[PDB]
Amino acid sequence: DTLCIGYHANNSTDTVDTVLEKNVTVTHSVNLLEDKHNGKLCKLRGVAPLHLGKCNIAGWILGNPECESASSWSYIVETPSSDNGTCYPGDFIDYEELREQLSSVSSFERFEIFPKTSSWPNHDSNKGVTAACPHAGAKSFYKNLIWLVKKGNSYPKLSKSYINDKGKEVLVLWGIHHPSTSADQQSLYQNADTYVFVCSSRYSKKFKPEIAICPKVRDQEGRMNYYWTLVEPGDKITFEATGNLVVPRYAFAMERNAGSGIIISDTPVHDCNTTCQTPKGAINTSLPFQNIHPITIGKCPKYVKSTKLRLATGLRNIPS
Amino acid sequence: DTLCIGYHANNSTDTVDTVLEKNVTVTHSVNLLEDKHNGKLCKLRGVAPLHLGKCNIAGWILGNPECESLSTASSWSYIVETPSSDNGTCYPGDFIDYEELREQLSSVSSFERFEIFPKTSSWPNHDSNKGVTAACPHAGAKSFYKNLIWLVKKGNSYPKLSKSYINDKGKEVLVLWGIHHPSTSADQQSLYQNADTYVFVCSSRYSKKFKPEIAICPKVRDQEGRMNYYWTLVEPGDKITFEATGNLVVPRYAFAMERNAGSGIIISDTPVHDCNTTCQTPKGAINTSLPFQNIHPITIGKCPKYVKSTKLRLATGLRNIPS
Amino acid sequence: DTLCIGYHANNSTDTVDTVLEKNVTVTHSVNLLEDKHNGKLCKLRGVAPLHLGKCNIAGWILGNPECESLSTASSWSYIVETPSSDNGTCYPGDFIDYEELREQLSSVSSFERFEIFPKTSSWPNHDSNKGVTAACPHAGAKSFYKNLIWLVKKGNSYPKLSKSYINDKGKEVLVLWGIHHPSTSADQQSLYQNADTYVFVCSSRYSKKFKPEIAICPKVRDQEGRMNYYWTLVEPGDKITFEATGNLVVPRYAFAMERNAGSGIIISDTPVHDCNTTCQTPKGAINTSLPFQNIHPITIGKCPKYVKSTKLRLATGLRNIPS
Amino acid sequence: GLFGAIAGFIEGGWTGMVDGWYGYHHQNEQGSGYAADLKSTQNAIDEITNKVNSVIEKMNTQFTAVGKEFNHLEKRIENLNKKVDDGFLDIWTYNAELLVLLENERTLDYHDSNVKNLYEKVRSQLKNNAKEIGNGCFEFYHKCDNTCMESVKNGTYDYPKYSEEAKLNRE
Amino acid sequence: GLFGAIAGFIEGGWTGMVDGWYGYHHQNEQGSGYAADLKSTQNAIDEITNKVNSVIEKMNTQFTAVGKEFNHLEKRIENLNKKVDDGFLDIWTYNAELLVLLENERTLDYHDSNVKNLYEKVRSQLKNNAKEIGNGCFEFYHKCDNTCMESVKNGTYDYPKYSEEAKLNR
Amino acid sequence: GLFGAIAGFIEGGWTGMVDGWYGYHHQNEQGSGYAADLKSTQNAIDEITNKVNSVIEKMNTQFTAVGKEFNHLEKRIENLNKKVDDGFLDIWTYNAELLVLLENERTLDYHDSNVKNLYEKVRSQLKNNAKEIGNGCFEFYHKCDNTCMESVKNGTYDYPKYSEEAKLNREEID
Ligand SMILES: CC(=O)N[C@H]1[C@H](O[C@@H]2[C@@H](O)[C@H](O)O[C@H](CO)[C@@H]2O)O[C@H](CO)[C@@H](O[C@@H]2O[C@H](CO[C@]3(C(=O)O)C[C@H](O)[C@@H](NC(C)=O)[C@H]([C@H](O)[C@H](O)CO)O3)[C@H](O)[C@H](O)[C@H]2O)[C@@H]1O
Ligand SMILES: CC(=O)N[C@H]1[C@H](O[C@@H]2[C@@H](O)[C@H](O)O[C@H](CO)[C@@H]2O)O[C@H](CO)[C@@H](O[C@@H]2O[C@H](CO[C@]3(C(=O)O)C[C@H](O)[C@@H](NC(C)=O)[C@H]([C@H](O)[C@H](O)CO)O3)[C@H](O)[C@H](O)[C@H]2O)[C@@H]1O
Ligand SMILES: *[C@@H]1O[C@H](CO)[C@@H](O)[C@H](O)[C@H]1NC(C)=O
Ligand SMILES: *[C@@H]1O[C@H](CO)[C@@H](O)[C@H](O)[C@H]1NC(C)=O
Ligand SMILES: *[C@@H]1O[C@H](CO)[C@@H](O)[C@H](O)[C@H]1NC(C)=O
Ligand SMILES: *[C@@H]1O[C@H](CO)[C@@H](O)[C@H](O)[C@H]1NC(C)=O
Ligand SMILES: *[C@@H]1O[C@H](CO)[C@@H](O)[C@H](O)[C@H]1NC(C)=O
């Protein structure tokens, strides 16, 4: 009569590594490394990204004619070929900071801050168009700004204020135009020596035209610089100018959302939820580690450049 | 006759988690998680913090009347502002590179306030009394910062002023100044006469030209005008020169100082106290006997590592089987 | 009659620490801590560093007379300055975005100095010879940066200057210029004739208008005036335009280059040698076999992780007990 | 292995014991077969499960948007940002790999220990009544039907009841 | 668990033994009692203290002011800073949690091992002058008085001294 | 030690045994000598080397220029940078030290385990035919010659073929 003590064996072929030995065959094991993604750009928090298509944030926010663009989004997606941005050449001041701050919002509403109907009685608001910003083959301009110009050989000093009665922050953007020549200066704004001044309770800046013949960009030798600021609720912002001012027409009442970001990718958007987004696709896993992509948005596994993290659960498999 | 081998058991109700099973009762254990503080803001490495009370750094470093400006402390380990430290720039305007100044003043050794341009003798050709405003009230009356002087036209002529200082101290000298921007051309003239003015400031390393920017801005503290604040650090051997035909708010007091590696600024209602620590938290001070800490992520000093854990107790004894 | 089971012992005096007991003598062991270097600055990835000698990056790139502009390599893996590398901007002034430039030149795969605006033909209506100073002395005479030309009026006049360069190089071209600020209106007229001047620079990406800021600033290398330095990278196919009525220190030589990601600047007296390394330290290179090192935290390349350990000895044999 | 049983003096596993992780094989008059030790097996599943859950559930990370955008004049902070991502990369890659290598060795040792403990428990019940015929097998010096076999698998084996008979079979 | 002794073939602990981690219960001609084993208990205390100190003392902490202030136009570096703190937070929380879980397991194994080794040690001295009666108990074949119990404990048991007598009772 | 052999019931090591980590010392009519168990010694070598290599080769590092330069008005990001470098320092230093402490304990435990396993393997073979006289030594109840001795070392000891002789010597001393 005999009694034998022994352990389980099976048809398992799974291998794991130990500090002492590599490629040990065990009866049972579990993977700790997430290496699968769904190839999609999904909703975070149950909220869709803002997808700008062939436009970049500059084109969308200024209202470039090729961009007609929700009241909420969890992050922003641009394509590698999102070229339609600032169609009139010039510097977009603090552009990356603006993009970061528009990356996620809980509330976003465009509104005519300075109604083109009655805002500018002493200036021409119908000539500010350009081949640099075409629409339907004809000269046009940004939808959210107005390129004011003299009427009847006179450009009176302008002074305009807006009081923020939106229960939240207001994003106001404006431009400063710099002619290539003094003839163009006079032709556009009459006055030769001009300024623009913009001030709220926080913000304050004075602008001067910088006239010169610069290299042609989109066939323009002149330039247009773009500026923005966030006006707090209850606060007033004032514009003063004797020329060269591209005035706000549409601004944005908004509620900013913390720490999201921007994805630049051809990956298609889709109606699914994820807790962790990659530019290659979404990741839905309970696993602690991940080797899909270092650049992620959400509550994600940690990125590692491992290709195998297999945890043994069972014992060494010895069928014999 | 028997002899039994065994292990200890006690009344201990302490529990620990092991990778194999949770909530195991053991005979003895110790906590690796610092989860207690003293609710005080303490001297860091023997050196007290600078508590600004109802003032912020701007108000303190400038002469804001509501601020004390002290005085016997030539050194501090960090700075404390209260969540209700509103008194700063009483005349609305921009304080350029303000956060940088705050970081750079967070910890200094030696800190000497001194009248870089004596009020009585410095400005014989300009009026150094009219420069007050309801924006910076003092005891109800119109006043101004203590560390700056707002010069205006004396009689009806603002002569080009030129004033220079050589750092005779054996340390960096922090110099602050302002540029006033009237709301109207009418005010420019009444103030400085000249209408078209400039201000120029330069050392060996620094050089900036200012020009007044006149416009009616929204009223802040009842002021439509503005006043921008600027600063710089003059090296030990260096000289700094000021030149203006108007609109300059001249330094009256500057600051000799030696800056340390760099601490930080705590904004908290926690009281400051006569205690000593090696790790300071906005909630209070903690000991540095344990490697981890869950009091607060934002610390100053040589601190345990902040973790999210609620307990981290390590077994020293064995499984408690009193049965 | 007996058989015994036992374990090896030897003359080893090596100790290791275990979590349970310190200084356990063991029969065999290895060190995981790299604690030695070769006292050399070496080639990184088969490419030598750029050693600037007594010059810093400012002096080298502007072409300060005491710096070598004729034989710099066509590529390098990092840059080395010595702690005393003094020769930089001999004419005083601000060098705008200097740290960024340093960073961006840290490692280059291709680098060609060429004459963007040849001196003999570019400036027929201006004086390209009198632009010298005792601030930048050379072979016993007033001189100036080799890569710039300080244009002055020819005869009694300084006509409007307007000139452009089209980058037909296969790559980015680094262009540097200066803006001169005289200390007096008289120096302004003596130099440029015109009292009220401007400089304008613009490419497709870059645009800036400059205005002389005239004032007597503290003397530096005998200069009360100032000269500010600027730069931009002109992308291939783009144009950069220069326009001025005075005060423009014009580009003469520029640098076609291809930048390599990252890398850095080592500031050390440690000599350069014909050695190849994968990890450089300011005090010498190290081997990347082991996972940890205590030589220096500031390294370049693929390096062991820096630690404050003095020893990480790993037991391999067993406890050594010879008796 | 650490405890010398698995892949040790017990040289192979049993596919015949699909019943569980550890157990016995007996043979006597009333038959023979593979029976898993339910107690020890179950305890191990419970403990190895907690192990796996620990490694996983303990991660619990902060919500983060990793990517950042810097312009052509922000190369320094851009490389500082890369330094942060790369440092985290090196930390997690090294620690994840070592975690698996070390814990895999410990898991194997664990199973080995469980087997050893089982075998030693039997060996200590019988002492003289059986002999150790190697490969983790015990041969009784006396008849041991089911009621006796189940007894040993209960830790309630009656040494005295068989001590006399067992004495004889040692020629 | 891992060494089979604690909660194993010695099913429970002794509340009665109040002066050490591992010890003895004796019961002879002149009374019974619990008595800690000093050599093994003190060694364990020394080794567990070394362990606790190691986990604590190896923690180097650079002087650091964690907090930063960025203005409304520095959101990117503000967020970068956040990623740093949060990054450090996930690394230290995960590693602290696993360290404690893992080492606690080891500490318990450690005690179990100590109890095992102690039982084995006494079993070695006794040889067959006593019987193994289970639950970590030895039954002496000879008359083992106090001075005998003392000598078994302190490892200086005199085998041949009682070898004859014990052999008698069988 | 965890397994109670090294520095335990086997009190000391053998300077005499110079060709291996673990082994045997025999003594009989034909004399005495030290012999290292070559198979278990070699297994331990391979496994320890793999341990050493894993701790080293799992460290793969990114190309990085650690140094950064900030001007006098960039103190905040300079301090952010320093916090990053200091953070990596504190994480790597702590993990390095603890790695070495814990793995050193495991390596010593490992050797101990091997020794104990070698002891049980022999004890298992000898069964009745020998006596355990402590200090890791077995005193045979029969006459064990070089050939006999050898069969124990390589695991081919024939218990039955000595039991009869053993039983008599066994009982006289028992
Ligand atoms: C202000 C203006 O119309 N400038 C054009 C200039 O007109 C001269 C005029 O200023 C002067 O008083 O009299 C002389 C007569 O000798 C000229 O008539 O003439 C230049 C040469 O043709 C033009 O340059 C061309 O501009 C082109 C772009 O035209 C548009 C544009 O599409 O952007 C047409 C728009 O209607 C106009 N917008 C507004 C609001 O007036 C703009 C605008 O002038 C500029 O964008 C402002 O900088 O120009 C191409 O750029 C072409 O390559 C270029 O030669 C001046 O446009
Ligand atoms: C060329 C020269 O020597 N200029 C000096 C100037 O003389 C003027 C003269 O050139 C002109 O024709 O007529 C006017 C009056 O109508 C003057 O007589 O006078 C200034 C006042 O004494 C001098 O200022 C001194 O400059 C010194 C530095 O000398 C250098 C220098 O090495 O930096 C000499 C260089 O030749 C000169 N370079 C050029 C291109 O002109 C520079 C340059 O003027 C300055 O760097 C511009 O900022 O100056 C000392 O700095 C001394 O302290 C100062 O008074 C002119 O040197
Ligand atoms: C995502 O979750 C939200 C609620 O949080 C829900 O409205 C939506 O249906 C979910 N999306 C999908 C595709 O399941
Ligand atoms: C001081 O602070 C109080 C409360 O914020 C404020 O109302 C008052 O105007 C301040 N005084 C000055 C001079 O700043
Ligand atoms: C130990 O033995 C080796 C081998 O002969 C010998 O070379 C060496 O001198 C000894 N070790 C030391 C450090 O003395
Ligand atoms: C120097 O060695 C490194 C790797 O260690 C390699 O990248 C480099 O190519 C070597 N030098 C050359 C020019 O081969
Ligand atoms: C070079 O540096 C030395 C100081 O080391 C200085 O005296 C000399 O003037 C410098 N030359 C130039 C042209 O910068």
Q: From chain A, pick out residues whose CB is under 8 angstroms from the CB of E87.
A: none
Q: Which helix (H) or strand (E) holds E28?
A: strand E22-28
The C-alpha atoms of residue A123 and residue D135 are separated, in whole angstroms, by 102
Taking alpha carbons only, the member of A189, A204, A262, A225 closest to residue A89 is: A225
The C-alpha atoms of residue C101 and residue F58 are separated, in whole angstroms, by 36
In Å, what is the CA distance from E106 to each residue of B63, D58, E50?
Answer: 63, 19, 14
The C-alpha atoms of residue E124 and residue F9 are separated, in whole angstroms, by 9
Is the Cβ of F154 closer than 8 Å to some Cβ of chain A?
no
Exposed (0-12), middle (13-18) or buried (19+): which is E43, by Cβ within 10 Å? middle
Nearest to E77 among D60, D77, D127 (CB): D77
3-state SS track over B12-28: CCCEECCCCCCCEEECC
Number of Cα atoms under 13 Å in the Cβ half of residue D148: 22
Give, rounded to a whole angstrom, the gap between the first and last alpha carbons of chain F.
32
Tokens 């514009």 found at: A239
Work out whether strand A262-264 and strand A76-78 pair parallel, antiparallel, or are unpaired. Answer: parallel
| B37 annotated among ligand-binding-site residues | no
Phi-psi region for residue E42, left (φ > 0), alpha (ψ -120 to 50) or beta? alpha
Give bridge partners of residue D33 from the DSSP assignment: D26
Strand order in the sheet with F130-134: F31-36, F22-28, C2-7, F137-140, F130-134
CA distance C293 to chain D (A): 15
Burial B114-146 (b: 16+ CB within 10 A, else e): eebbeeeebbeebebeebebebbbeeeeebbbb
Burial B180-212 (b: 16+ CB within 10 A, else e): bbbbeeeebeebbbbeebbbbbbbbbbbebbeb
Task: Tell me which residues have their CB closer than 6 angstroms to ligand 3.
Answer: A 43, 46, 271-273
The C-alpha atoms of residue B162 and residue B147 are separated, in whole angstroms, by 19
CA distance C91 to chain F (A): 20
Is the Cβ of C75 closer than 8 Å to some Cβ of chain F?
no
* Atom of ligand 7 at shortest range from CA of C138: 13
Is the Cβ of D57 closer than 8 Å to some Cβ of chain E?
no
Exposed (0-12), middle (13-18) or buried (19+): which is A37, by Cβ within 10 Å? buried
Q: From chain D, pick out residues whose CB is under 8 angstroms from the CB of C292.
A: none
Are A120 and A148 in contact, with CB atoms under 8 Å apart?
yes
The C-alpha atoms of residue F130 and residue F143 are separated, in whole angstroms, by 10
User: Which CATH number covers residue E139?
Assistant: 3.90.20.10
DSSP 8-state assignment for residue F140: E
Please give the domain boundaries of chain A with CATH numbers for all domains: 1-41+271-320 (2.10.77.10), 42-270 (3.90.209.20)
Domain tally, chain F: 1
- Evaluate: CB of B167 within 6 angstroms of ligand 4: no
Q: State the DSSP string of C253-288.
A: EEEEEEEPS---EEE--PPEEEEEESEEETTEE--S
Interface probe with D: pick from A7, A275, A305, most Cβ of D within 10 Å? A7
**Quick one: tokens of F66?**
């650690």
Contacts of C259 (CB under 8 A, 6+ apart): C104, C105, C107, C108, C109, C172
CB contact under 8 A, A305 and F60: yes
Contacts of B18 (CB under 8 A, 6+ apart): B24, B315, E101, E104, E105, E108
- Evaluate: CB of C190 within 6 angstroms of ligand 2: yes
Q: For chain F, list the contacting chains (3+ Cβ pairs, <8 Å).
A: A, B, C, D, E
C-alpha Rg value of chain C to the nearest Å: 29
Are A190 and A261 in contact, with CB atoms under 8 Å apart?
no
In Å, what is the CA distance from D150 to each residue of B103, D122, D155, D158, E1?
Answer: 77, 11, 9, 12, 23
- Within a 10 A sphere around the Cβ of A68, how many other Cβ atoms? 9
The C-alpha atoms of residue E26 and residue E16 are separated, in whole angstroms, by 12
Is the Cβ of A299 closer than 8 Å to some Cβ of chain F?
no
Task: Tell me which residues have their CB closer than 6 angstroms to ligand 1.
Answer: A 127-132, 139, 147, 149, 179-180, 183-184, 187-188, 219-220, 222
Are E21 and E114 in contact, with CB atoms under 8 Å apart?
yes
CA distance F165 to chain B (A): 35
The C-alpha atoms of residue C300 and residue F61 are separated, in whole angstroms, by 12
* Atom of ligand 2 at shortest range from CA of C184: 48
Ligand 6: which of C38, C77, C278 to mutate, most ligand atoms within 8 Å of CB? C278
Is the Cβ of A232 closer than 8 Å to some Cβ of chain E?
no
The C-alpha atoms of residue B72 and residue B70 are separated, in whole angstroms, by 6
Q: For chain E, list the contacting chains (3+ Cβ pairs, <8 Å).
A: A, B, C, D, F
SS3 state of residue F57: helix
The C-alpha atoms of residue B114 and residue B96 are separated, in whole angstroms, by 22
For the four alpha carbons of C314, C318, C319 and D2, in that order, the dihedral sign comes to positive
SS3 state of residue B119: helix
In Å, what is the CA distance from D61 to each residue of A310, B69, D64, D68?
Answer: 21, 45, 9, 19
Give the distance from CA B236 to its chain's centroid.
23
Give, rounded to a whole angstrom, the gap between the first and last alpha carbons of chain E.
35
For the four alpha carbons of A129, A134, A138 and A141, in that order, the dihedral sign comes to negative
The C-alpha atoms of residue A82 and residue A99 are separated, in whole angstroms, by 14
CA distance E72 to chain D (A): 16
| B296 annotated among ligand-binding-site residues | no
Give bridge partners of residue F150 from the DSSP assignment: none
Q: State the DSSP string of C44-96.
A: ETTBPPEE-TTB-HHHHHHT-TTS--SS--S-BS-EEE-TT--BS-SS-S-BT
Are A23 and D157 in contact, with CB atoms under 8 Å apart?
no
Quote the ligand 3 centre to D56 CA distance (angstroms).
25
Ligand 6: which of C276, C277, C289, C303 to mutate, most ligand atoms within 8 Å of CB? C276
Are A61 and A144 in contact, with CB atoms under 8 Å apart?
yes
Burial A274-313 (b: 16+ CB within 10 A, else e): bbbbbbbbbbebebbbbbbbbbbbbebbbbbebeebbbbb
Are B62 and B229 in contact, with CB atoms under 8 Å apart?
yes
C-alpha Rg value of chain F to the nearest Å: 27
Strand order in the sheet with C265-267: C50-51, C79-81, C265-267
Ligand 6: which of C42, C45, C109, C263 to mutate, most ligand atoms within 8 Å of CB? C45
The C-alpha atoms of residue C223 and residue A110 are separated, in whole angstroms, by 55
Q: From chain D, pick out residues whose CB is under 8 angstroms from the CB of F114.
A: none
Q: Which helix (H) or strand (E) holds B101?
A: helix B98-104
Ligand 3: which of A43, A47, A274 to mutate, most ligand atoms within 8 Å of CB? A43
Give the residue numbers in C contacting A (CB under 8 Å), as ranges. 164, 200, 202-204, 207, 209, 238-241, 243
Q: From chain E, pick out residues whose CB is under 8 angstroms from the CB of F76.
A: 68-70
| B28 annotated among ligand-binding-site residues | yes
Give the distance from CA A300 to its chain's centroid.
22
CB contact under 8 A, A312 and D107: yes
Resolution (Å units): 2.2
Give bridge partners of residue C149 from the DSSP assignment: C250
Phi-psi region for residue B292, left (φ > 0), alpha (ψ -120 to 50) or beta? beta
User: Which residue range(s) make up the domain with D99?
Assistant: 1-171
- Evaluate: CB of C221 within 6 angstroms of ligand 2: no
Contacts of C220 (CB under 8 A, 6+ apart): B204, C92
Quote the ligand 2 centre to F58 CA distance (angstroms).
66
Are D83 and F88 in contact, with CB atoms under 8 Å apart?
no
- Evaluate: CB of C134 within 6 angstroms of ligand 2: yes
**Quick one: tokens of A188?**
């556009």
The C-alpha atoms of residue B250 and residue F119 are separated, in whole angstroms, by 91
